[PDB]
Amino acid sequence: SIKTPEDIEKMRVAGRLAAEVLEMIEPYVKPGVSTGELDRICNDYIVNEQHAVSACLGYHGYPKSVCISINEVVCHGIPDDAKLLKDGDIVNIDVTVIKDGFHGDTSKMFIVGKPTIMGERLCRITQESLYLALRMVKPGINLREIGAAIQKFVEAEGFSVVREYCGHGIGRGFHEEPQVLHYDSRETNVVLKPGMTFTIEPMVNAGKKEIRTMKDGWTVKTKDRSLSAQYEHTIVVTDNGCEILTLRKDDTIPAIISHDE
Ligand SMILES: [Mn+2]
Ligand SMILES: [Mn+2]
Numbered sequence: 001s002i003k004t005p006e007d008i009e010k011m012r013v014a015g016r017l018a019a020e021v022l023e024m025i026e027p028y029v030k031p032g033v034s035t036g037e038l039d040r041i042c043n044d045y046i047v048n049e050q051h052a053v054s055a056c057l058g059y060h061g062y063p064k065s066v067c068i069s070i071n072e073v074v075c076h077g078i079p080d081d082a083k084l085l086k087d088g089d090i091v092n093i094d095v096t097v098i099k100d101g102f103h104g105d106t107s108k109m110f111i112v113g114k115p116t117i118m119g120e121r122l123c124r125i126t127q128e129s130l131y132l133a134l135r136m137v138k139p140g141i142n143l144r145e146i147g148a149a150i151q152k153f154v155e156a157e158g159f160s161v162v163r164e165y166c167g168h169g170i171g172r173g174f175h176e177e178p179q180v181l182h183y184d185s186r187e188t189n190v191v192l193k194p195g196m197t198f199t200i201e202p203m204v205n206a207g208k209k210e211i212r213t214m215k216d217g218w219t220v221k222t223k224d225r226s227l228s229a230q231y232e233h234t235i236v237v238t239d240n241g242c243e244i245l246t247l248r249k250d251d252t253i254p255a256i257i258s259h260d261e
């Protein structure tokens with residue numbers, strides 16, 4: 001799927017909105033706030049201000065507008081009014097918006113209250129793994145290299161990479177081809193071409209890689225109950241690199257990454 005100059009522009013709009021939801025919610029992510037209220041804030045904003053729609057809601061029956069995962073929760077945490085954030089917590093807020101027919105998908109970690117050493121480190125190393133992978137993207141390279149480089153980096157830090165979930169192609173469809181694994185796999189055989197749009201979203205655990213799913217059909221936790229973090233960005237392969245469509249002001253990497261010169 002090679003997006004056209006116009007479709008790419010739409011992806012920029014959808015990606016920007018997704019990223020802006022994360023920038024907007026930051027001030028609300030504090031101790032004592034419930035994940036349920038954070039969700040309502042994000043939804044009212046997406047609908048009433050961005051004039052877009054959450055792609056998560058209803059997707060395979062997902063009940064909320066955004067996914068919020070805390071500490072040992074790996075992904076797909078469901079916003080709840082009874083779940084309050086507290087100091088030391090590391091929280092992922094996963095956002096997916098649909099606008100003008102195109103999707104914008106992204107997520108980041110938030111450290112609540114006073115940070116713990118492992119909390120700050122895990123999140124930091126996880127973002128560094130995403131950035132390292134991003135700096136690699138450019139026409140010609142094979143997706144298998146990006147996944148191999150992520151796993152290599154993360155494991156040398158003494159952490160592990162989650163296997164059950166992966167990045168994905170994205171466009172008029174929420175999840176399109178190809179699959180973007182965050183570890184080395186002999187199945188990956190894709191040569192990036194300019195115009196391609198997909199996501200990179202590594203999930204990293206402080207302990208072992210195994211993840212156990214809960215009895216609600218969604219919530220995934222680490223088997224050993226160790227902390228797990230994830231960061232996600234949607235990108236578009238440019239002629240000499242890539243462009244991050246969901247870049248935020250707090251990101252410390254440039255929107256456009258060039259390689260030719
Ligand atoms: Mn995604
Ligand atoms: Mn996502």
Ligand code: NA
Pocket residue numbers: 069070071072073074075090092227228229
């Ligand atoms: Na987590």
